[PDB]
Amino acid sequence: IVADHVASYGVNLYQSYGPSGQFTHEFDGDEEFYVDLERKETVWKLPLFHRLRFDPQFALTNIAVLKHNLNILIKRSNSTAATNEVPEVTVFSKSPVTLGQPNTLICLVDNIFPPVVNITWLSNGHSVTEGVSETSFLSKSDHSFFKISYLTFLPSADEIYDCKVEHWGLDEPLLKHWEPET
Amino acid sequence: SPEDFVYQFKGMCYFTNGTERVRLVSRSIYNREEIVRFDSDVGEFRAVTLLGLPAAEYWNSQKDILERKRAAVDRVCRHNYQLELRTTLQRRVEPTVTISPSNLLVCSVTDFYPAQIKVRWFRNGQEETAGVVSTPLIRNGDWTFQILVMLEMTPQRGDVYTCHVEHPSLQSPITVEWRAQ
């Protein structure tokens, strides 16, 4: 479908593995907010100041419908399970890289299905948790997902990074390398 | 590998020329297979696969459900576009433009929004059409984009290379100049 703008109000997800769900609104491919279904909380991702409010009880009620439909469809499909896809991983910097100037490493994990993934960062073989964040599972038109993890870092000639992703579609943990150009 | 069963519901809105054409397509998906769909152009639930046929027939038999779905393009898509006009659609972030050698010359256009952008290469005032290879538009996920546009160059004396960038955030185009060193 060809359009100037595409929005999802919203993206509803529920799966059987460790009964998990997700609720988001997307506009032109970017996450506007998600509802923390455990904390019953709307978490806003809009990059601007606003007074917008969204009742998180809507998401819980909608996801409960998805859970109802999924359990019936599991029967009707003769327990046809999800097929594990091979994810595609790319690591790149947000901005041009200057030594000693704060930047952000971006790990794009594309073609994710089912939406269960572990994304971690390594620096010189050591685990890194400071300055790490990630988006929600973001929708695709073929109904797979993609997810982006960020690592704010100080570019240095002594520091070397890997993005490590684990997914059932992979026989092995996938490590994607990134070095500062020098 | 453990077993997983996935259900997705997407309430999708499509806008063309602002609110001139507004279209709602709600998609019920089992795993990665869309099974039922309500397209506002069509006006009723349609089974995409056999798995969704009982659902489409049942929902179509419910008059109150059909009435709510037929109004959804106005109560959801049109209603929310007014909020977007006051928020997301006002967002303008100007691109950062840099040129650096990789023989390929890379014009790097980073951290801009929205996605609409035009980039062109010039050499000694002449627009280079061929030899220009461009990456896809890269979504950063933080409401910014970047794109890299390369030019096959032959380092030949004082050839003046210029990257020319147009974007809705710019009142005038950005021109950045690079010369071989």
Binding site: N62 | A55, N80
Partner: peptide, 13 residues
């Protein structure tokens, strides 16, 4: 007015 969102319908058992 808060943002609106589309509801999913329950299927029959």
């Amino acid at each position: 007015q808060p943002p609106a969102s589309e509801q999913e319908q329950p299927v029959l058992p």
